[PDB]
């Protein structure tokens, strides 16, 4: 009775909160909470948002070097999901910070959650215009450091990923 589970557009709203760089006084200092999760609903027919296991912005200036370092060991092993990231990278041609879609699909997650989050994968990706890079993760190690995101954006960015070299 379906091709997959549907995207619920609040994922596009909280994506729009992260989508733009904006006015100084609060927006950049509060909205750019990188590593937010998009997850399957109660009835199992919608992809919705789940508040992720991350840090915000000013908190990067304290006891945690980056918000990816929060995320990469606060993911479920027995489930799949999508994550949204905002990856800062230097070359020496320019300094980018671009939006990335990540599909977390560890082999310890069951075939039915895999099949479900694979079904809707293209639909949420084709709704989020200005995602410039996308990848899928399968082990527990291919996820780990910030520089392990860099060849997935493309091997020209090897100079600095989130302030850390590849």
């Amino acid at each position: 009775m379906a091709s997959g589970v549907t995207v619920n557009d609040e994922v596009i709203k909280v994506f729009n909160d992260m989508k733009v760089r904006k006015s100084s006084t609060q927006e950049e200092i509060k909205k750019r909470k990188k590593a937010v999760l998009f997850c399957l609903s109660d009835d199992k027919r919608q992809i919705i948002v789940e508040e992720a296991k991350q840090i915000l912005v000013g908190d990067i200036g304290d006891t945690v070097e980056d918000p990816y370092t929060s995320f990469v060991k606060l993911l479920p092993l027995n489930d799949c999901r999508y994550a949204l990231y905002d990856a800062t990278y230097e070359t020496k041609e320019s300094k980018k910070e671009d939006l990335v879609f990540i599909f977390w699909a560890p082999e310890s997650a069951p075939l039915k959650s895999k099949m479900i989050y694979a079904s809707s994968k293209d639909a949420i990706k084709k709704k989020f215009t200005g995602i410039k890079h996308e990848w899928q993760v399968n082990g527990l190690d291919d996820i780990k450091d910030r520089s392990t995101l860099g060849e997935k954006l493309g091997g020209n960015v090897v100079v600095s990923l989130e302030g850390k070299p590849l």
């Binding site: 099949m115 989050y117 399968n138």
Partner: protein, 375 residues
């Protein structure tokens, strides 16, 4: 609260048809897609609701029946026995009339348009079903594996096929199919046991040779060494009890059978091996995509249940692909029901149910509707 809408799931696969309910993670019924009509010399009277025996029954009562194949190439051609096969599945093996239950079918890579439209017809007409879908084999396996780009090498009893996938869409002009299948492995496995003097020729012995196929077989690494090891050590020889207590033993033939997918020419085919067919289908895709296909080879189909096959494919693809590429073979746990486990979970999703491919959108949109919900 959870929905009472349990759908029916039928994989047509290749050779072996497999069926059950959406929410079951394994089929409730599995049989060979074979049908047998009587001969008029020796015709039986008082059998079934139909003119032809199906599945195991058609092989359980031999000689008098003239057997016919409604599927070959993995593609449906007959419908006058395929619509018996589905009926005997629902009303005698699964124990229901399908009139309350949505019914999902599996499609083979490069299936003609109209076969989905005949699948819309027979469900709503012949079987009275409320809704349907048709989903292509290689996507169901790759989605259930938790990937989004790569190549599926699928290997069943009717055909073996190599299907490149990009985002979730199959690249059609890059697909390859090898003729060599679990059928020809059975043809060969009987004949090479007969070369050990263990003659097997009948329909009764064929299914014991199939039971041996599904138990004792594995792919060898570095063939001549495994041959020489079997020819000097009984470590690779393994025994089997036949139905009434008579014992046989099989060695070389346990891997010399599986080797026929890497060497089709050992049965006799002009065809290139599964690794060559994988290489040639990757090499028929675009310059910037080929990198991700070489690095994402998914094994599928019931003939990939053999140990050593992914372990061997790692040797065979690195003899063909550039050594700057880094070949990952993805061997999943389930392989026999690969497309049906993906199809079963897809069949439980009722996200769009009220304007779908339902029985009473048919009187408006006709059998054309099926292609308008195909991604």
């Amino acid at each position: 609260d959870e929905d009472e809408t349990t759908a029916l799931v039928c994989d047509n696969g290749s050779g072996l048809v497999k069926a059950g309910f959406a929410g079951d993670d394994a089929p409730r019924a599995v049989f060979p897609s074979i049908v047998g009509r009587p001969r008029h010399q020796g015709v039986m009277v008082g059998m079934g609701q139909k003119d032809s025996y199906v599945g195991d029954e058609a092989q359980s009562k031999r000689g008098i029946l003239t057997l016919k194949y409604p599927i070959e190439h993995g593609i449906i051609t007959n419908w006058d026995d395929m619509e018996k096969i589905w009926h005997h599945t629902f009303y005698n093996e699964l124990r229901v009339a399908p009139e309350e239950h949505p019914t999902l079918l599996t499609e083979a890579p490069l299936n003609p348009k109209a076969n989905r439209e005949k699948m819309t017809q027979i469900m709503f007409e012949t079987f009275n079903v409320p809704a349907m879908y048709v989903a292509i084999q290689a996507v169901l396996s790759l989605y259930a594996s938790g990937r989004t780009t790569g190549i599926v090498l699928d290997s069943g009893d009717g055909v073996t096929h190599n299907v490149p996938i990009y985002e979730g869409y199959a690249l059609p002009h890059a697909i390859m199919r090898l003729d060599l299948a679990g059928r020809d492995l059975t043809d060969y496995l009987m004949k090479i046991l007969t070369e050990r003097g263990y003659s097997f020729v009948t329909t009764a012995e064929r299914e014991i040779v199939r039971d041996i196929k599904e138990k004792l077989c594995y792919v060898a690494l570095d063939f001549e060494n495994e041959m020489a090891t079997a020819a000097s050590s009984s470590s690779l020889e393994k025994s089997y009890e036949l139905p009434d207590g008579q014992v046989i033993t099989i060695g070389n033939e346990r891997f010399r059978c599986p080797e026929t997918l890497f060497q089709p020419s050992f049965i006799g085919m002009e065809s290139a091996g599964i690794h060559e067919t994988t290489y040639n289908s990757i090499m028929k895709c675009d310059i910037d995509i080929r990198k991700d296909l070489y690095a994402n080879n998914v094994m599928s189909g019931g003939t990939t249940m053999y140990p050593g096959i992914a372990d061997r494919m790692q040797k065979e693809i690195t003899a063909l692909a550039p050594s700057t590429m880094k070949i990952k073979i993805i061997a999943p746990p389930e392989r026999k029901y690969s497309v049906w486990i993906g199809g079963s979970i897809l069949a439980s999703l009722s996200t769009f149910q009220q304007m779908w491919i339902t029985k009473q959108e048919y009187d408006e949109a006709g059998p054309s509707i099926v292609h308008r919900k195909c991604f």
